[PDB]
Design a protein around this motif. Structure first.
Motif, PDB file in Angstrom:
ATOM      1  N   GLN A 196     -11.756 -33.765 -15.505  1.00 54.94           N
ATOM      2  CA  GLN A 196     -12.146 -35.159 -15.323  1.00 54.94           C
ATOM      3  C   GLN A 196     -12.837 -35.351 -13.981  1.00 54.94           C
ATOM      4  O   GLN A 196     -12.496 -34.700 -12.990  1.00 54.94           O
ATOM      5  CB  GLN A 196     -10.920 -36.075 -15.405  1.00 54.94           C
ATOM      6  N   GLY A 207     -15.144 -38.686 -11.606  1.00 51.61           N
ATOM      7  CA  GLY A 207     -15.491 -40.085 -11.514  1.00 51.61           C
ATOM      8  C   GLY A 207     -14.628 -40.834 -10.522  1.00 51.61           C
ATOM      9  O   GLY A 207     -13.457 -40.502 -10.301  1.00 51.61           O
ATOM     10  N   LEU A 229     -16.076 -42.724 -16.163  1.00 51.94           N
ATOM     11  CA  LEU A 229     -15.434 -41.427 -16.002  1.00 51.94           C
ATOM     12  C   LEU A 229     -16.073 -40.420 -16.942  1.00 51.94           C
ATOM     13  O   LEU A 229     -16.624 -40.786 -17.982  1.00 51.94           O
ATOM     14  CB  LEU A 229     -13.937 -41.485 -16.297  1.00 51.94           C
ATOM     15  N   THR A 273      -7.133 -39.414 -14.016  1.00 51.19           N
ATOM     16  CA  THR A 273      -7.812 -40.064 -12.898  1.00 51.19           C
ATOM     17  C   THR A 273      -7.139 -41.400 -12.654  1.00 51.19           C
ATOM     18  O   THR A 273      -7.119 -42.252 -13.547  1.00 51.19           O
ATOM     19  CB  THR A 273      -9.298 -40.285 -13.196  1.00 51.19           C
TER      20      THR A 273
END
Lengths: 224, 209
Positions: free
Chosen positions: A6, A8, A20, A121
């Motif tokens: 992941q 972002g 994201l 995240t």
């Protein structure tokens, strides 16, 4: 395993857009045996499915009613990734966001259970400015404990390592607390042999990515 | 649209206990029930799918059963590493979770007090930190005394998640004063009351000593 990476920014101002990306290794985003989901988690609402994209004869999209008209999930076949865009965010959207792969083979079919997950995240919806931490020693007393106080940063998270990752046994990094200033603070401690205090160096490595802050603080007995 | 409940919402069980957790669905479906295990700082991990099929590599002490609207996850002999929140999932809905804590023998905290650093004092603020290390149960009473005057409203506590190996907790209490207020007092003391201690432990320092 299929690996999901992941990326972002976590911090999004109210009314603006959360974006994201999830990069996939070990499967193709276009696979007709896979589906690609976004899930979020918060203390209040638990785990909530947000939406799904998958390719069969064409690309399909399925979205939760809870984020109706605010969500887009797109795949990028050239980069082998998929993304989440959530518009007009409010404080209700503060959460940890996960990408995941749906699909497990059983009974000669595929059930949409989530076998692989991204690392998560943390997304904070706030108008406040980013601020990096100050890092202060928690010096060992003259069997022994020492640490670092990581004070006054925004937003979450920070990471703390000891001796660049060499020292893991006996480490406790506490959950941050939000202070009356609206800034976070935490401590990371470790217990070590008292006999080591003169000859073994102890350095805490603090990373606060939202502010591009990296701090190393040597923690030593206080002189006088 | 389906809704899921879980029972109990939390439990504390000793190593070796048989643990049973239930998931109830609000209606029957064509979907297949999955069970996930989530440990701190990590994504949920799939343990069981299709109600009863164990994911490859998951220890056989985990099993799943049930049908219709009522499903169960059983752990036949609870281990320290099984501290986690367990979730069921049906179609796209997750249950609210069951938090499993390991019940173990009482363990007294090791207590440490840290004065503020000289570096922080130049900035105008004083943080005094009291550490309670590796104790059980989680409940603990920490009192700050400044020149033997009980402090209130100027401290914050934080507690770690249960340790996956020894099933203990650690706790920090941080007393925050202005540099001026810190300089108007001499004796800083953290007094710890806990089930593992037959009488309270006090750790203290004298400012400047």
């Amino acid at each position: 395993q299929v690996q999901l990476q992941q990326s972002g920014p976590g911090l999004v101002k109210p009314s603006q857009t959360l974006s994201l990306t999830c990069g996939i290794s070990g499967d193709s985003v276009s696979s007709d045996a896979a589906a690609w989901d976004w899930i979020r988690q918060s203390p209040s609402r638990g785990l909530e499915w947000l939406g799904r994209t998958f390719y069969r004869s064409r690309w399909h999209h399925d979205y939760s009613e809870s984020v109706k008209n605010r969500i887009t999930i797109n795949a990028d076949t050239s980069k082998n990734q998929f993304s989440l865009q959530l518009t007009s965010v409010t404080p209700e959207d503060t959460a940890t966001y996960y990408c995941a792969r749906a699909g497990v083979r059983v009974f000669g079919i595929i059930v949409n259970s989530l076998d692989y997950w991204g690392q998560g995240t943390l997304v904070t919806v706030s108008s406040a400015s980013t601020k990096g931490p100050s890092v202060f020693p928690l010096a060992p007393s003259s069997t022994a404990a020492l640490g670092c106080l990581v004070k006054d940063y925004f937003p979450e998270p920070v990471t703390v390592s000891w001796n660049s990752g060499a020292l893991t046994s006996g480490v406790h990094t506490f959950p941050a607390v939000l202070q009356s200033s609206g800034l976070y603070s935490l401590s990371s401690v470790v217990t070590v042999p008292s006999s080591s205090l003169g000859t073994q160096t102890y350095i805490c490595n603090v990373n606060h990515k939202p502010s591009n802050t990296k701090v190393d603080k040597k923690v030593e007995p206080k002189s006088c | 649209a389906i809704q899921l409940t879980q029972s109990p919402s939390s439990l504390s069980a000793s190593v070796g206990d048989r643990v049973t957790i239930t998931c109830r669905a609000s209606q029957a479906t064509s979907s297949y029930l999955a069970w996930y295990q989530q440990k701190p700082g990590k994504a949920p991990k799939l343990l069981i799918y299709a109600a009863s099929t164990l994911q490859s590599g998951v220890p056989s002490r985990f099993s799943g059963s049930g049908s219709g609207t009522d499903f169960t996850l059983t752990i036949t002999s609870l281990q320290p590493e099984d501290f986690a929140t367990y979730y069921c999932q049906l179609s796209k809905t997750f249950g609210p979770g069951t938090k499993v804590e390991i019940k173990r023998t009482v363990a007294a905290p090791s207590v440490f007090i840290f004065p503020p650093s000289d570096e922080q004092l130049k900035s105008g603020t004083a943080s005094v930190v009291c550490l309670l290390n590796n104790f059980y149960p989680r409940e603990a009473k920490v009192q700050w005394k400044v020149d033997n005057a009980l402090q209130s409203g100027n401290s914050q506590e934080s507690v770690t998640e249960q340790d996956s190996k020894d099933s203990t907790y650690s706790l920090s209490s941080t007393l925050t004063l202005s540099k001026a207020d810190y300089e108007k007092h001499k004796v800083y003391a953290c007094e710890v009351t806990h089930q593992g201690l037959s009488s309270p432990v006090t750790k203290s320092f004298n400012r400047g000593e």
